[PDB]
Design an enzyme around this catalytic site. Structure first.
Site, PDB file in Angstrom:
ATOM      1  N   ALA C  99       0.811  -1.207   0.000  1.00 56.52           N
ATOM      2  CA  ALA C  99       0.000   0.000   0.000  1.00 56.52           C
ATOM      3  C   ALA C  99       0.846   1.259   0.000  1.00 56.52           C
ATOM      4  O   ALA C  99       0.311   2.376   0.059  1.00 56.52           O
ATOM      5  CB  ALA C  99      -0.959  -0.011   1.221  1.00 56.52           C
ATOM      6  N   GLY C 143       1.260   2.533   8.595  1.00 52.92           N
ATOM      7  CA  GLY C 143       1.413   1.857   7.322  1.00 52.92           C
ATOM      8  C   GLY C 143       0.158   1.917   6.458  1.00 52.92           C
ATOM      9  O   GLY C 143      -0.928   2.116   6.973  1.00 52.92           O
ATOM     10  N   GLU C 183       2.357   9.200   7.971  1.00 54.01           N
ATOM     11  CA  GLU C 183       1.722   8.393   9.038  1.00 54.01           C
ATOM     12  C   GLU C 183       0.634   9.110   9.859  1.00 54.01           C
ATOM     13  O   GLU C 183      -0.362   8.493  10.230  1.00 54.01           O
ATOM     14  CB  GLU C 183       2.787   7.775   9.929  1.00 54.01           C
ATOM     15  CG  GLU C 183       3.621   6.792   9.116  1.00 54.01           C
ATOM     16  CD  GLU C 183       4.491   5.879   9.951  1.00 54.01           C
ATOM     17  OE1 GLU C 183       5.610   5.549   9.483  1.00 54.01           O
ATOM     18  OE2 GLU C 183       4.049   5.461  11.047  1.00 54.01           O
ATOM     19  N   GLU C 254     -16.224  -8.692  28.418  1.00 49.97           N
ATOM     20  CA  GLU C 254     -15.853  -8.177  29.732  1.00 49.97           C
ATOM     21  C   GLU C 254     -14.831  -7.019  29.635  1.00 49.97           C
ATOM     22  O   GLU C 254     -14.791  -6.146  30.496  1.00 49.97           O
ATOM     23  CB  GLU C 254     -15.330  -9.318  30.611  1.00 49.97           C
ATOM     24  CG  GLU C 254     -15.582  -9.105  32.094  1.00 49.97           C
ATOM     25  CD  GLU C 254     -15.074 -10.246  32.959  1.00 49.97           C
ATOM     26  OE1 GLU C 254     -15.279 -11.421  32.575  1.00 49.97           O
ATOM     27  OE2 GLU C 254     -14.475  -9.953  34.025  1.00 49.97           O
TER      28      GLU C 254
HETATM   29  N1  LIG Z   1       6.469  -1.870  17.064  1.00 46.95           N
HETATM   30  C1  LIG Z   1       6.591  -2.136  15.775  1.00 46.95           C
HETATM   31  N2  LIG Z   1       6.299  -1.174  14.833  1.00 46.95           N
HETATM   32  C2  LIG Z   1       6.435  -1.489  13.527  1.00 46.95           C
HETATM   33  C3  LIG Z   1       6.857  -2.746  13.114  1.00 46.95           C
HETATM   34  N3  LIG Z   1       6.893  -2.735  11.747  1.00 46.95           N
HETATM   35  C4  LIG Z   1       6.501  -1.509  11.311  1.00 46.95           C
HETATM   36  N4  LIG Z   1       6.227  -0.737  12.407  1.00 46.95           N
HETATM   37  C5  LIG Z   1       5.727   0.626  12.458  1.00 46.95           C
HETATM   38  O1  LIG Z   1       4.543   0.644  11.678  1.00 46.95           O
HETATM   39  C6  LIG Z   1       4.551   1.781  10.819  1.00 46.95           C
HETATM   40  C7  LIG Z   1       4.754   1.327   9.384  1.00 46.95           C
HETATM   41  O2  LIG Z   1       3.667   0.519   9.036  1.00 46.95           O
HETATM   42  P1  LIG Z   1       3.864  -0.982   8.517  1.00 46.95           P
HETATM   43  O3  LIG Z   1       3.198  -2.017   9.405  1.00 46.95           O
HETATM   44  O4  LIG Z   1       5.318  -1.258   8.359  1.00 46.95           O
HETATM   45  O5  LIG Z   1       3.143  -0.810   7.093  1.00 46.95           O
HETATM   46  P2  LIG Z   1       2.178  -1.881   6.403  1.00 46.95           P
HETATM   47  O6  LIG Z   1       0.987  -2.183   7.298  1.00 46.95           O
HETATM   48  O7  LIG Z   1       2.931  -3.130   6.084  1.00 46.95           O
HETATM   49  O8  LIG Z   1       1.646  -1.065   5.110  1.00 46.95           O
HETATM   50  P3  LIG Z   1       2.417  -0.929   3.690  1.00 46.95           P
HETATM   51  O9  LIG Z   1       3.837  -1.456   3.759  1.00 46.95           O
HETATM   52  O10 LIG Z   1       2.354   0.524   3.357  1.00 46.95           O
HETATM   53  O11 LIG Z   1       1.663  -1.806   2.714  1.00 46.95           O
HETATM   54  C8  LIG Z   1       5.709   2.645  11.286  1.00 46.95           C
HETATM   55  O12 LIG Z   1       5.234   3.503  12.290  1.00 46.95           O
HETATM   56  C9  LIG Z   1       6.677   1.617  11.848  1.00 46.95           C
HETATM   57  O13 LIG Z   1       7.551   2.108  12.822  1.00 46.95           O
HETATM   58  C10 LIG Z   1       7.138  -3.720  14.082  1.00 46.95           C
HETATM   59  O14 LIG Z   1       7.524  -4.863  13.803  1.00 46.95           O
HETATM   60  N5  LIG Z   1       6.987  -3.398  15.397  1.00 46.95           N
END
Ligand SMILES: Nc1nc2c(ncn2[C@@H]2O[C@H](COP(=O)(O)OP(=O)(O)OP(=O)(O)O)[C@@H](O)[C@H]2O)c(=O)[nH]1
Ligand SMILES: Nc1ncnc2c1ncn2[C@@H]1O[C@H](COP(=O)(O)OP(=O)(O)CP(=O)(O)O)[C@@H](O)[C@H]1O
Ligand SMILES: Nc1nc2c(ncn2[C@@H]2O[C@H](COP(=O)(O)OP(=O)(O)O)[C@@H](O)[C@H]2O)c(=O)[nH]1
Ligand SMILES: [Ca+2]
Ligand SMILES: [Ca+2]
Ligand SMILES: [Ca+2]
Ligand SMILES: [Cl-]
Ligand SMILES: [Mg+2]
Ligand SMILES: [Mg+2]
Ligand SMILES: [Mg+2]
Ligand SMILES: [Mg+2]
Ligand SMILES: [Mg+2]
EC number: 3.6.5.-
Lengths: 54, 353, 442, 425
Positions: C99, C143, C183, C254
């Protein structure tokens, strides 16, 4: 400070302590929204292809 | 190079702090809405504390304590004293006070106010009270005129015993109040500026006409206009500590420290230690300091009474230079060091029991 | 026994899910190959752990879980790694291109083409359930998939399972580890459209976890692996009541009942202690009083904010390890007289307390030392609204210039959705303020 | 989002394109014969973004070589890595384009373009998930500029939902072949403003100054200029070519870098500046140098504008903590230069594999409003000639009208106005 609803089992226990008492859109609608977005993409793309055609 | 932002253009104290920081050549001023700052000199209203301490790579400090309004609001202060155990209803240094909402608003204490007002109707005791809101003052021994005046207004007022037996400077037979400046730093050290000021009345006190409010209100504004002797005894109406002390030594055979300052220090520390757990920034993601102005009255027995606490005070003209320098010294450079004989007295006391 | 289905969406939701299921397996004595010796009813049962695991006749215990990502690289590592045997192929769903950190692309463009497949895969799991409680949904705010696809999924889940409860574990964006300037947009967009479909959502700010890792695990520069192992401990604390014998928060309903009186204000603050480094040579074990006290320190919260300057609507304390009620109550008594803890007028000042005697399980070779006792506090405090204000401000800064907006419109989203979402957040902030605050040169 | 299709067009495009392939082939362990001989598996993890695999586990660049005359492609084929390219991907004519945009775009190039799109299509069809295209070319000649922008239009028409990315060499009177370069560049910029998503502006002015002032090269050759360019190109494509979190594909990069569709022209930078030294460089030094105007490849003063967005990439073994600390330090200490209405607009990646010859390197990609200085420069050179219609017969002779010149100029001045607008917002 009253303890209530104390429940015990082999794995642990729970209870409550009180310190003081009280002083959706349908499938149809979703599909329409997704289809309308798709049509807007289609129109913007058609406009581009027209411009490129010229 | 440290960075700061100014968000209260109408503050004289911090306009001066701002200037001093610039002059050190180690502080640069950002546009008021740039978030990459070390220091926020905040606005008075709705300071966005929730947006502080979320800037990686920046230690962030702000010149107000979130929650300090509890001390610095007429109605808040009364409530805080009466309901805080360490202050209590048994607090000997705060004038009997009650919080009163207008009828158009209707919690309220009107009920209980009259209960004691009666024992003074009966008692024969001085039953004069003052009313004020956080302009807008009335002094009278008739409650009916108090409660009435309050309902005419639209906001919360407080009714407080008027001190009928104030200490009077001679010559003049005149009132005054004492202002003291207190700086609380990020560590919650409490620092009393060693210079205070008496805002004096220039008109002789008189306990028969409580509606002639020029000998009853020592406010420097109400004195510079409505009073015809503004500046006769001092410039004005401002007597400072060296002189008030010499006066106390000559007239009453005492010192400023013994008769009055002990009590002031006790009151300041008691108020601020009360609210410490609710406002301290000790383990917080941003830190706070604040300059307060405590206002006191002194009765004829040389007893000190807290009038109010101001969270956003100005200073006396000739005192800005030193006080403001002191603020960058102990509140700012302490957190952000640049590349004595303090002007402050550290309020601390550890009685064991 | 009533089943719960877990749904992991996008990279953050998937990688966090990896870490939670690893930990669950450790806690329940389930091996990587799915076998569970201590489980004597072979091929079935209705034990509490069955809420999260199903059973095969071969004695395999299989997570009631679906993994979804619009690109394959992250889920491919589940398919290939230590717990590959745990998961059935149909449970691991990937698209081809992602995305691109664009909510609109995750929600409208790519969501439309994969949503039916995802639901049918969830239906498969549901069909295996005698009495499905509902769903736990793991995703990032920032994301494009985590924001855009999740909100689509949540809408359709309300449609296909209208009576089922829906809980979220949401990762709120922090610049120290974030991957996109937009974001804040994605966060508001997804919160706006998901709001009415989520019953209770546990927000975790990466900033808070990042700093807990630096400060208490002495990690110079935390990775996702460090972050997710910590996050998985907190998630385990929260779901333990669903997976073990007990009497508090024993079903999804709950959570709402105990923590969410007002349905829009459904974001409880989690606070966890203690977090101690496994590298710490000498460590004095912390008491019930000490770990309970640490629950009221912003430094230990999943979102940095100040509960002293808000009000509480509810508070649950979840202990694991050597804890009995008397020590909890003595600790609370002491804490009540040393701290600012104000409840809203229309709620009792009190705590619901759960104790599970098994102390936290940690991953062999992880960063966390094992401790004799720990606690997770879940409190519904208005102070969490500080996080919304932070987000809404960043959104306002960019949106006023329309920066990046064309990326979203180009995906078929109308600009108008920006202002509607923003307006919903403004209402949200105002609600918190009404519940939380009284009306307040000299 | 996996495969990228690379196209290089004209003399400049093919000479810098060749060097690019030599440089990244080396980083990925690929030898001239297409055989892998590396030691680390990080090298092969994302090799398919740029290379197709053939039999014998030979790796073949997904690269198409285009020119309207055979000369430079003969040179390329005889060059170091010449045999690595797919022979059918050499698409060339015989007539040349005479440093004339009209010949590249409308006459000589129109005759050749279909055969190029034939090869582009063959490459695209064997892509599991094509993310888009990258084109190397100059804007000052005829084939790279005129035919390169024609190809871009045709590629867009056939693949409207894919990303289009260019490395575009901007002309300078200081390093010039003909006087019509401002015409060819103005006509080309107009095309790029509409039909690319991301354009790295490589200014021959800056490359020359760097070689002269910084590398102490008294007489810089195109070869010296191209050393800097291939280093920058390796740098800015690091995140596409190796495992990573940030800007790992062309679409995420564009989403992080382009707030407004037309403002997609980037100023690249590189540190340390090197020429064909054993000085260990510290993370604080890399960081200061990557942001130094003197390390910028577009001849614009970053202090004359503001950064809308920035991507920084650090390579080598170094402290992540110190990297994070240093990047925060530059932003915090020069915060006026980063627009306040895009919060956190600076993003940083690190990759453990450094380029050849270095222990540590850093590459900078900025979207700064100061890039308007480049377009203003070209605009002034264009107008000096156009107001007297000088040299126009070379273009009207290929069927073009003056009006098209007036329009390209107006559109480029518009682009300048759009940068100024956000510099003051
Ligand atoms: N705590 C934590 N945050 C994560 C992790 N992976 C990505 N993030 C956070 O999530 C956000 C990025 O979204 P992602 O989950 O990587 O994106 P996605 O849902 O895969 O969406 P697209 O790649 O755009 O298709 C950022 O704020 C990152 O720091 C993780 O493994 N742990
Ligand atoms: N309870 C009391 N007894 C006797 N005098 C009192 C009194 N309360 C107030 N005063 C007198 O009233 C004046 C104080 O006014 P007030 O307390 O409302 O301050 P203020 O809010 O008007 C301006 P500032 O915040 O700068 O002090 C004092 O100068 C003092 O003379
Ligand atoms: N950096 C660089 N610039 C070049 C090179 N060759 C030509 N140029 C520049 O490119 C422009 C001329 O275009 P060119 O590529 O030679 O013409 P084309 O074959 O018709 O595309 C001029 O601005 C030259 O300064 C090269 O190898 N490197
Ligand atoms: Ca069983
Ligand atoms: Ca519902
Ligand atoms: Ca011909
Ligand atoms: Cl249902
Ligand atoms: Mg006063
Ligand atoms: Mg006042
Ligand atoms: Mg992803
Ligand atoms: Mg040439
Ligand atoms: Mg054909």
């Amino acid at each position: 400070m009253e303890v209530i609803e104390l429940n015990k089992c082999t794995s642990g226990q729970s209870f409550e302590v009180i310190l003081k008492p009280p002083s959706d859109p349908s499938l149809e609608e979703i599909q329409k929204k997704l289809e309308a977005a798709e049509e807007r993409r289609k129109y913007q793309e058609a406009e581009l292809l027209k411009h490129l055609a010229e | 190079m440290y960075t700061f932002v100014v968000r209260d253009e109408n503050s004289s104290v911090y306009a001066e702090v701002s200037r001093l920081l610039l002059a050190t050549g180690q502080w640069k001023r950002l546009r008021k809405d740039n978030p990459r700052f070390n220091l926020m000199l905040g606005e008075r209203n709705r300071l966005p504390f929730g947006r502080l301490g979320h800037e990686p790579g920046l230690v962030q400090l702000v010149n107000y304590y979130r929650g300090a309004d509890k001390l610095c609001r007429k109605a808040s202060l009364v409530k805080l004293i009466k309901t805080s155990p360490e202050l209590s209803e048994s607090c000997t240094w705060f004038p009997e006070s009650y919080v009163i909402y207008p009828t158009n608003l209707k919690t309220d204490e009107r009920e209980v106010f009259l209960a004691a007002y009666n024992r003074r109707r009966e008692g024969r005791e001085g039953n004069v009270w003052i009313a004020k809101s956080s302009e807008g003052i009335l002094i009278s021994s008739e409650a009916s005129e108090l409660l009435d005046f309050i309902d005419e207004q639209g906001q919360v007022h407080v009714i407080q015993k008027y001190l009928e037996k104030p200490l009077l400077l001679e010559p003049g037979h005149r009132k005054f109040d004492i202002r003291s400046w207190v700086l609380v730093d990020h560590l919650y050290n409490i620092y009393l500026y060693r210079e205070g000021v008496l805002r004096t009345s220039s008109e002789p006190y008189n306990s028969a006409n409580f509606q002639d409010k020029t000998c009853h209100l020592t406010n420097h504004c109400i004195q510079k206009e409505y009073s015809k002797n503004y500046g006769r005894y001092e410039e004005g109406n401002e007597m400072f500590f060296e002189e008030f002390n010499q006066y106390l030594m000559d007239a009453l055979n005492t010192t400023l420290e013994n008769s009055i300052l002990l009590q002031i220090k006790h009151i300041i520390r008691s108020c601020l230690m009360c609210i410490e757990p609710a406002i301290s920034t000790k383990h917080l993601h941003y830190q706070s300091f604040q300059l307060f102005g405590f206002d006191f009255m002194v009765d004829e027995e040389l007893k000190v009474w807290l009038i109010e606490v101001n969270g956003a005070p100005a200073c006396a003209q000739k005192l800005y230079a030193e006080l403001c320098q002191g603020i960058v010294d102990v509140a700012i450079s302490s957190v952000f060091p640049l590349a004595p004989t303090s002007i402050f007295i550290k309020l601390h006391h550890h009685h064991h029991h | 026994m009533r089943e719960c289905i877990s749904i992991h969406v996008g990279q953050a939701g998937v990688q966090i899910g990896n870490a939670c299921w690893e930990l669950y397996c450790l806690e329940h004595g389930i091996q990587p190959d799915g076998q569970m010796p201590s489980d004597k009813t072979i091929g079935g049962g209705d034990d509490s752990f069955n809420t999260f695991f199903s059973e095969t006749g071969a004695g395999k215990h299989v997570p009631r879980a679906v993994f979804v990502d619009l690109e394959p690289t992250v889920i491919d590592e589940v398919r290939t790694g230590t717990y590959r045997q745990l998961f059935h192929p149909e449970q691991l769903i990937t698209g081809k291109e992602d995305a691109a950190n664009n909510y609109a692309r995750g929600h409208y463009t790519i969501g439309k083409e994969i949503i039916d497949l995802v639901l049918d895969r969830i239906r498969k799991l549901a069909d295996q359930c005698t009495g499905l409680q509902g769903f736990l949904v793991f995703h990032s705010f920032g994301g494009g998939t985590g924001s855009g696809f999740t909100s689509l999924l949540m809408e359709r889940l309300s449609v296909d399972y209208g009576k089922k409860s829906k809980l979220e574990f949401s990762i709120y964006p922090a610049p120290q580890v974030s991957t996109a300037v937009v974001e804040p947009y994605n966060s508001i967009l997804t919160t706006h459209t998901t709001l009415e479909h989520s019953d209770c959502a546990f927000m975790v700010d990466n900033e808070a976890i990042y700093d807990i890792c630096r400060r208490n695990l002495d990690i110079e520069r935390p990775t996702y692996t460090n972050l997710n192992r910590l996050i998985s401990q907190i998630v385990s604390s929260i779901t333990a009541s669903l997976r073990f014998d007990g009497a508090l928060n024993v079903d999804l309903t709950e959570f709402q009942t105990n923590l969410v009186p007002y349905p829009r204000i459904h974001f409880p603050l989690a606070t966890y202690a203690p977090v101690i480094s496994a590298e710490k040579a000498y460590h004095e074990q912390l008491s019930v009083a000490e770990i309970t006290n640490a629950c009221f320190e912003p430094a230990n919260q999943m979102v940095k904010c100040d509960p002293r300057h808000g009000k509480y609507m509810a508070c649950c304390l979840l202990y694991r390890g050597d804890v009995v009620p008397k020590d909890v109550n003595a600790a609370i008594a002491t804490i009540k007289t040393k701290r600012s803890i104000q409840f809203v007028d229309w709620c009792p000042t009190g705590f619901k307390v759960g104790i599970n005697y098994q102390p936290p399980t940690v991953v062999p070779g992880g960063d966390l030392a094992k401790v004799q006792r720990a606690v997770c506090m879940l409190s519904n405090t208005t102070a969490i609204a500080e996080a919304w204000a932070r987000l809404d401000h960043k959104f306002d800064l960019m949106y006023a210039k329309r920066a990046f907006v064309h990326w979203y419109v180009g995906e078929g989203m109308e600009e108008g959705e920006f202002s509607e979402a923003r307006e919903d957040m403004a209402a949200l902030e105002k609600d918190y303020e009404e519940v939380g605050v009284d009306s307040v040169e000299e | 989002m996996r495969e990228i299709v690379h196209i290089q067009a004209g003399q400049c495009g093919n000479q810098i394109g060749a060097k690019f392939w030599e440089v990244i082939s080396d980083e990925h362990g690929i030898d001239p014969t297409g055989s892998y001989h590396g030691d680390s598996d990080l090298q092969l993890e994302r090799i398919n973004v740029y290379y197709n695999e053939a039999t014998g586990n030979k790796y073949v660049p997904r690269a198409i070589l285009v020119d309207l005359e055979p000369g430079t492609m003969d040179s390329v084929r005889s060059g170091p890595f010449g045999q690595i390219f797919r022979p059918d991907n050499f698409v060339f004519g015989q007539s040349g384009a005479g440093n004339n945009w009209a010949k590249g775009h409308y006459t000589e190039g129109a005759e050749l373009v279909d055969s190029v799109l034939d090869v582009v299509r063959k490459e695209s069809e064997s892509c599991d998930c094509l993310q888009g295209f990258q084109l190397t070319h100059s804007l000052g000649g005829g084939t790279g500029s005129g035919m390169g922008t024609l190809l871009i239009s045709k590629i867009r028409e056939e693949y409207p939902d894919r990303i289009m990315n260019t490395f575009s060499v901007m002309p300078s009177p200081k390093v010039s072949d003909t006087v019509v370069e401002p015409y060819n560049a103005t006509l080309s910029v107009h095309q790029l403003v509409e039909n690319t998503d991301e354009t790295y502006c490589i200014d021959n002015e800056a490359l020359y100054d760097i070689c002269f002032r910084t590398l102490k090269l008294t007489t810089p050759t195109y070869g010296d200029l191209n050393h800097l360019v291939s280093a920058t190109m390796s740098g800015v494509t690091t995140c596409l070519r190796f495992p990573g979190q940030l800007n790992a594909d062309l679409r995420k990069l564009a989403v992080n870098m382009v707030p407004f569709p037309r403002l997609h022209f980037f100023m690249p930078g590189f540190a340390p500046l090197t020429s064909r030294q054993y000085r260990a460089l510290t993370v604080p030094e890399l960081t200061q140098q990557m942001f130094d105007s003197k390390n910028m490849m577009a001849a614009c003063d970053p202090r004359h504008g503001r950064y809308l967005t920035v991507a920084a990439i650090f390579r080598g073994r170094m402290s992540m903590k110190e990297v994070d600390e240093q990047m925060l330090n530059v932003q915090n200490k020069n915060s006026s230069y980063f627009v306040e209405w895009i919060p956190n607009n600076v993003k940083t990646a690190v990759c453990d594999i450094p380029p050849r010859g270095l222990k540590m390197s850093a590459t900078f990609i900025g979207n700064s409003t100061a890039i308007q200085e480049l377009f203003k420069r070209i605009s002034e050179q264009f107008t000096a000639m156009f107001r007297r219609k000088a040299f126009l017969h070379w273009y009207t002779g290929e069927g073009m009208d003056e009006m098209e010149f007036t329009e390209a100029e107006s559109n480029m001045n518009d682009l300048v106005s759009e940068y100024q607008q956000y510099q003051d917002a």
